[PDB]
């Protein structure tokens, strides 16, 4: 019915008016490319050949467009159509008369997409503003869209079968709009959290930690090769940190050349000892933490997620705030290229050698588990004797579960801490966790020491069978193994009952992901529809379509969210 | 023992039987995170391999068969009953967990191009097209014949030379996209000759015809099935996954010279990023690499039953130490480009890698001024129909946030469904307009002078007319 057509989603009101299928759009699998800049995207030749951007013939560009017309559709840098002044369209594929090929001012040649054509790159779902960013086009000879790895974080895209949509603006006006509002370098900093959206990620973060250690010393030829990939190099080789006996540069010395201009920033490495700041060696840090950059030169410190990641006050954030968006784009690209070419010399890996720990550490983990199981048994025996006293506001069952969970959690964390102590400097799990590129202390703990308690619906594994979790366990068993505690690590291997309980926990995780996607989508749409028309007028009042004043100044101070920074008032706290 | 239960009434035959068919192919499942076993269960269904030994006789749509399937070097005992050895899906690959050039970052994979040349992960894709000569029409007969442009009033400019006299292309003839696999003609009633009814190859198939069959179907009409074969050498978009839930595309392909090489000369067939392992906690992958190295040297297929208690990482490591390698499986690697030893020692070992059905060639689409829908006069939908990608409502909200009003206008009006209507000034309702006659008149007012041209999306015109059919009057007044 008419109402049926209009009412539902994919009806005329929403599925054909608010959103609709569009021309000049392309889609294919995305794959990484470290060599491409932040703003560049790699487009396959076939996609570039099908898509055409009309160019008006001017006296300036008549020769170039004439050559493109002569090439035709077959040769790649060719023109698919010619649009005359009358509006007549001469498809060059079917034979055009040599008279038709002649061009005059006012004709519009539809050339194939070429290097440097601005396009809009999208990945569904388009949760935030950074999910549609304008990319320059670089044609490369394979059939996948290729984008730089730092740009993955705004799109929330990884290259495991993902796909993205490519929209080519078809007019100079809309092309300029994209170029000056939505290009990737212009949207490095999000107004949502006044933090940079994009940060150094994956191999480059892990390798920048290793590159910036005090230990790293680079000989002459390695310095040559690293400087070769630096786009903004002045052409002057920095004086080596160690002139004699053999000239040896340092990792920080080369990274200082990457740092744009003169940027001043002080950040702390992840492994920074808390007592260091109060005690001596506060400035001459013993662990080479407390990153300090003065005059755009890395005086000291080990870079990590905190310094080069997506957090307020990061080196990239200070670069965007101070130097500008263009120099910051060059900064991202140069970090990636130089550090990735050093990683060929150094290299990274993950092996079983990382998971395995010392025998003493394994014995300590086992002893912690033994005494924890004994403590749980003592709590159970107290509960059976009714000696246990109920916690205020909780039933005896609830307080028994609370105490048992506390004992098991303390044991789990203690075994994890022992495992994390066992890790050597060379351990690669530690490299990735310390750098912040991937993983967490919890993952190391589960890999090495103890997987941990499996909880479903906020409780230990429930009694699915009559008064027992699995048929193998005895009725009314509230002990650690029966209710889900997985003593073995992933490396050690889960016992079969622990395997089933672990599967139960993982299933809860999967279900939560599936549910959250839909519910969050509905919430986001409703918020947008409620506040879509609100904008800052030229009075700088924030008004809706009705012209009712939502706010007299935007944010009550009339400032945009990206420019602001965290600061301390310093008059508030001190005593009189 | 210390008394727990003295009244056992039944015993399990083996705990590994709790797993199903797809989860049984996972080696060392107990050493993986649970969501990763779940993901491997789904990826294994999509792997490529010889699906059945009678595949030559069968004419199925979308049948992929790998050139050189291999059975796993590290196999579960329960795989034998699943017949995975008889019909394997995947190839054991020398896999190095390393960061080489940054093209293996995220989940992507650097593959050896020389190995690809030698048959590594090569597959064939058979597509079958069926057509039925239907004489059921009263005066319509869908005869099989080669259409002729002069004889047939309805015809297409795609290549018709391939078709033989029967209208069916002979096996062994290459077919490029937009070529006529089968030529069929419907005789046209002469109300007062021919509307073309040939079937055309899916774009970019680029295959060679394998088998052409002519039979009579259930209805008794002549039935023709044509199977087209396309070899599929792996590319830099194809999706490869191991048995432990690690899926990823091929970032780039380096030749044997460029790949890092051990002192023995072994270069990894596949290089995966080290960053995949820790967050996903798929240690089963690492133990499978170690057991595969031990098995390839020893010559016995490794056992990876989930719950064994006789196979430990330490025992595997000692066994490998006997065969001359580092006990944890790491190997000293040399950089292919420069020859210098890589300072960190890379973990290299054979690992069963699979090839999934998802490939870049089947997933690449580009649209520019294509056909439009009848109802909405908007671009079609789908790769088969050359459909444009949808600019959803979330996308338009992002564009509003940008402030790119003119890009939003182009994308939502000018690129999709541009249209013009004539609207009376006195009454907002649209008015009849004869451009060729140059006479524009509005019914209901008897007014000709006051008419204005309005540019609106065709979908909006359809919306307003549907409102009018419901007796609502959407009077659009320029004033």
């Amino acid at each position: 019915s008419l109402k049926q057509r209009l009412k539902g989603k994919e009806g005329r009101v929403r599925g054909n008016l608010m959103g609709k299928r569009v021309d000049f759009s392309a889609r294919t699998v995305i794959t990484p490319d470290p060599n491409l800049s932040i703003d560049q995207v790699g487009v396959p030749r076939s996609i570039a050949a099908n898509m055409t951007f009309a160019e008006i013939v001017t006296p300036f560009n008549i020769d170039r467009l004439q050559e493109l017309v002569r090439r035709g559709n077959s040769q790649y840098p060719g023109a698919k159509y010619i649009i005359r002044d009358n509006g007549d369209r001469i498809d060059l594929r079917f034979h055009p008369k040599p008279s038709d090929l002649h061009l005059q001012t006012g004709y519009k040649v539809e050339r194939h997409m070429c290097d440097g054509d601005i396009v809009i790159f999208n990945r569904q779902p388009t949760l935030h503003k950074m999910s549609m960013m304008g990319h320059r086009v670089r044609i490369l000879p394979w059939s996948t869209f290729r984008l730089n790895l730092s740009v993955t974080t705004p799109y929330n895209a990884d290259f495991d079968g993902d796909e993205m949509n490519l929209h080519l603006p078809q007019s100079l006006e809309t092309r300029a709009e994209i170029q000056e509002l939505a290009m990737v370098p212009r949207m490095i900093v999000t107004p949502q959290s006044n933090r940079p959206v994009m940060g150094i990620v994956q191999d480059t973060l892990t390798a920048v930690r290793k590159f910036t250690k005090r230990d790293v010393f680079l000989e002459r030829g390695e310095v040559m090769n690293l400087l070769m990939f630096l786009s903004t190099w002045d052409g002057k080789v920095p004086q080596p940190a160690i002139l004699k006996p053999r000239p040896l540069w340092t990792g920080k010395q080369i990274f200082s050349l990457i740092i744009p201009g003169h940027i001043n920033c002080i950040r702390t490495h992840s492994t920074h000892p808390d007592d260091e700041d109060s005690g001596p060696y506060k400035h001459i840090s013993p662990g080479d933490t407390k990153v300090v950059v003065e005059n755009g030169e890395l005086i000291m410190g080990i870079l990590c997620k905190k310094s080069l990641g997506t957090s307020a006050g990061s080196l990239v954030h200070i670069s965007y705030l101070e130097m500008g968006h263009d120099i910051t784009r060059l900064f991202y690209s140069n970090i990636q290229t130089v550090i990735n070419n050093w990683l060929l010399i150094e290299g990274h890996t993950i092996g079983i050698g990382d998971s395995i720990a010392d025998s003493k550490t394994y014995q300590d983990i086992q002893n912690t588990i033994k005494k924890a199981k004994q403590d749980v048994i003592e709590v159970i025996e107290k509960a059976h004797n009714n000696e246990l006293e109920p916690t205020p506001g909780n039933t005896l069952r609830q307080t028994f579960e609370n105490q048992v969970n506390r004992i098991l959690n303390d044991a789990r964390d203690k075994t994890g801490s022992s495992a994390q102590k066992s890790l050597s400097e060379y351990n690669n799990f530690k490299s990735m966790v310390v750098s912040g590129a991937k993983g967490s202390k919890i993952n190391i703990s589960q890999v090495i020491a103890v997987v941990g308690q499996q909880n479903v619906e906020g409780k230990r594994i429930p009694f699915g069978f009559k008064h027992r979790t699995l048929p193998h366990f005895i009725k009314d068993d509230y002990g650690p193994e029966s209710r889900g505690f997985v003593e073995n690590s992933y490396l050690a291997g889960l016992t079969p009952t622990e395997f089933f309980f672990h599967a139960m926990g993982g299933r809860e995780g999967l279900i939560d992901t599936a549910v959250k996607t839909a519910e969050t989508g509905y919430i986001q749409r409703r918020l947008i529809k409620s506040m879509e028309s609100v904008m800052v007028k030229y009075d700088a009042t924030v008004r809706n379509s009705i012209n009712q004043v939502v706010q007299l100044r935007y944010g009550e101070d009339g400032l945009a969210g990206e420019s602001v920074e965290f600061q301390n008032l310093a008059t508030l706290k001190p005593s009189n | 023992e210390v008394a727990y239960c003295s009244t056992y009434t039944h015993c399990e035959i083996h705990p590994s039987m709790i797993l199903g068919v797809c989860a049984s192919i996972i080696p060392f499942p107990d050493h993986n995170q649970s969501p990763r076993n779940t993901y491997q269960s789904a990826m294994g269904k999509q792997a490529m391999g010889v699906y059945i030994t009678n595949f030559h006789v069968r004419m199925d749509t979308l049948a992929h068969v790998l050139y050189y399937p291999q059975k796993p070097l590290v196999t579960t005992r329960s795989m034998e009953y699943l017949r995975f050895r008889e019909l394997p899906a995947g190839i054991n690959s020398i896999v190095a967990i390393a960061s080489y050039t940054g093209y293996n970052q995220e989940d992507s994979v650097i593959m050896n191009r020389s190995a690809v040349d030698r048959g590594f992960f090569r597959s064939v894709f058979y597509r079958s097209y069926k057509e039925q000569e239907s004489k059921k029409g009263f005066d319509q007969e869908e005869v099989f014949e080669k259409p002729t442009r002069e004889t047939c009033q309805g015809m297409r400019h795609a290549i018709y030379d391939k078709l033989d006299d029967d209208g069916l292309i002979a096996p062994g003839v290459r077919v490029s996209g937009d070529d006529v696999i089968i030529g069929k003609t419907v005789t046209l009633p002469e109300n007062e000759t021919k509307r073309d009814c040939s079937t055309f190859l899916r774009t970019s198939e680029t295959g060679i015809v394998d088998q052409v069959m002519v039979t009579l179907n259930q209805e008794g009409y002549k039935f023709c099935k044509i199977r087209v074969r396309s070899v599929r050498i792996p590319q830099i978009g194809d999706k490869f996954a191991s048995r432990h839930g690690q899926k990823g595309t091929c970032g780039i392909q380096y030749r044997q010279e460029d790949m890092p090489f051990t002192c023995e000369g072994i270069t990894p067939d596949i290089i995966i990023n080290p960053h995949a392992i820790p967050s996903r906690m798929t240690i089963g992958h690492l133990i499978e690499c170690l057991q595969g190295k031990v098995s390839a040297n020893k010559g016995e297929i490794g056992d990876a039953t989930p719950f064994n208690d006789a196979v430990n990482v330490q025992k595997i490591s000692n066994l490998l130490s006997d065969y001359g390698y580092h006990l944890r499986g790491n190997e000293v690697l040399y950089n292919g480009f420069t020859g210098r030893k890589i300072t960190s020692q890379i973990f290299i070992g054979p690992t069963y890698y699979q090839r999934l059905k998802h490939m870049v060639d089947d997933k690449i689409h580009s649209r520019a001024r294509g056909p439009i829908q009848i109802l909405n006069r908007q671009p079609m939908e789908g790769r088969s129909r050359d459909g444009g990608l949808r600019f959803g409502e979330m996308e338009r909200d992002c564009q509003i946030a940008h402030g790119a009003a003119q890009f939003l206008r182009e994308r939502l009006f000018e690129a999709s469904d541009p249209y013009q209507v004539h609207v009376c000034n006195l009454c907002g309702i649209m008015a009849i307009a004869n451009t060729r006659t140059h006479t524009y008149e509005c019914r209901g007012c008897r007014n000709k002078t006051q008419i204005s041209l309005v540019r609106m999306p065709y979908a909006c015109k359809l919306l307003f007319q549907e409102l009018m059919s419901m007796s609502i009057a959407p009077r659009m007044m320029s004033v």
Partner: peptide
């Protein structure tokens, strides 16, 4: 899969 306070 860790604990009651963590993740499943």
């Amino acid at each position: 899969i860790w604990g009651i306070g963590c993740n499943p």
